[PDB]
Symmetry: C2
Subunit: 332 residues, 2 copies
């Protein structure tokens, strides 16, 4: 039977999300039938379920926006997809948390199947965001530096690899944790040049730590508040701090003096917006670019924990945690 994770109300996922059976539709022409392979659980998925997000699928909705599916069949007039093909959603809002679906062929985009399933299941979001943010805001050349916060996130980790494979120098801010030393070695082996604490940055010894290497023209923010204020402080005259995450109650603060005399810029990044503003093919090249790095071992999936659709509540809970050790991946 067809099992799906659906929420009829907006609220705390562990309460809102419930497992349901669904009848499949008909492959009526341009439609495509898929068997979900793996669906991660991401923060944007949680926010959506909570009702705090830029795009809200009508209730009752199927949870999830990212994941890999294998084509099982195609509609009378489907040209680009043959069964056995691997697909990911063309844009957010699809509802990936379900065993099987029938989707319009334009809501999907084929990915190579010669990559690790785990990579394919998590390629459409974090690595794309990381890549775009490195490209679309400042023109970075090898030797140039990038400063970021939440460096242990799915995005930060991907930014570290991509940056490295790009010939860039990353200075990464990580949250204070019991063993910040364990983390350091981890990211450093990911390509990270510098790993510093939210603390080491807000000390007085920062105006000089950043002395030997070139100041960053790009800052990546996902935290906000004082963390974000400190990122702004590390920027060179005219640099850009792109915010791509954070809390709805943890706003970004910009010094009047930093905006005027240092001419800093503050922007946002929304992958769904870029995907909707661009052609399917353009999203396709980005994927091709990311598969390239994968094949040459320069981009690797992060800690995965595969959970059967059956036990979504445990997975769901584990993702609500700020210190979640590994990415929860729903499998069916």
């Amino acid at each position: 039977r067809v099992r799906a994770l659906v929420y009829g109300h907006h609220g705390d996922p562990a309460k809102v999300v419930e497992l349901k059976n669904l009848e499949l539709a008909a492959v009526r022409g341009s439609d495509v039938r898929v068997k979900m392979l793996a669906a991660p659980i991401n923060p944007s998925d949680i926010n959506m379920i909570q009702g705090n997000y830029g795009l809200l699928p009508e209730l009752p909705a199927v949870g999830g926006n990212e994941g890999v599916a294998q084509v099982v069949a195609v509609g009378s007039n489907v040209t680009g997809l043959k069964p056995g093909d691997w697909v990911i959603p063309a844009n957010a809002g699809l509802g990936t948390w379900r065993t099987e679906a029938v989707f319009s062929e334009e809501a999907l985009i084929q990915v190579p199947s010669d990559i690790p399933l785990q990579s394919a299941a998590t390629l459409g979001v974090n690595p794309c965001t990381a890549y775009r943010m490195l490209m679309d805001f400042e023109q970075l050349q090898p030797g140039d530096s990038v400063i970021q916060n939440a460096s242990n996130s799915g995005v930060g980790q991907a930014v570290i690899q991509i940056a490295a494979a790009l010939g860039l120098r990353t200075i990464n801010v990580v949250r204070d944790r019991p063993d910040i030393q364990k983390l350091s070695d981890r990211l450093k082996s990911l390509g990270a040049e510098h790993v510093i604490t939210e603390e080491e940055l807000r000390r007085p010894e920062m105006k000089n730590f950043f002395k030997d290497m070139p100041q960053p023209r790009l800052a990546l923010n996902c935290v906000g508040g004082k963390s974000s204020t400190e990122l702004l402080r590390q920027l060179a005259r005219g640099g850009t701090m792109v915010t791509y995450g954070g809390m709805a109650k943890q706003p970004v603060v910009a010094s009047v003096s930093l905006l005027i005399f240092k001419d800093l810029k503050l922007r946002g990044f929304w992958l769904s917006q870029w995907k909707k503003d661009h052609s399917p093919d353009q999203f396709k090249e980005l994927i091709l670019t990311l598969c390239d790095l994968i094949r040459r071992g320069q981009l690797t999936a992060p800690a995965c924990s595969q959970v059967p659709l059956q036990d979504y509540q445990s997975a769901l809970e584990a993702s609500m945690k700020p210190f979640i050790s590994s990415k929860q991946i729903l499998t069916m």
Copy 2:
């Protein structure tokens, strides 16, 4: 005697600034002599004396960055200025609060003598800031809307007129005051399409007040804090909020959701930097363009109080006040 308003230490103007007699230099070569006609007292002058500014002239310094003057005599090789010529400063830092001075010819710029001297004394700063902010961030067409705060300030007032001459629609936010009704009628007659309070803007009836007319792609900030976040809320997707002033302890606050899902941009504008990044001819073009609005009565001088250089403390005092009725102008 050559009188000047100088400060040997940085700090509260009403304390640091004192009248000093000075010895004039020699018209050595490219130097240019001038008799100060009138010098306004601007916020950037205050921040300069106080010490909180991006360009600080070495102490002891003469106060003032704006003003009109007449050429008395020129140096051995002066090509463009003949005595009796009216000039203003080419860039900030010159030190205009004095009766007489000798400036290098490049530090000056001729102003047509067929504009009022009153206009000419406030032309090099506020109207320039306004016109640049209307041009350098968003490409506005006739019919487009713009929003600003501190609409009753020198800049705000110039924005209203220039925006009007530009065929644009302004929505002007004024601070709350005993009789916000007097102010409103004033600005409205300057061309302001709407005049609104800080209060009226933070109610709920705002998500709809902006329903009939088009949303602005441009927001002009001078306050910061909650007022700057409310200005932020009124922007159309992709809009820019430009900050050209405010308190050093009243930073700009950007909501995560606004930067991300609305793709809002936050910038700064510093006239002094634009003037240094650009050619004299480019400054001359700006000046000619502004002098044209004046000529046609589309840009008029703001209210002022003229004060002999003698009583400077009086004018200084008046200007450090948040509700200052008129621009304090020094005469010599």
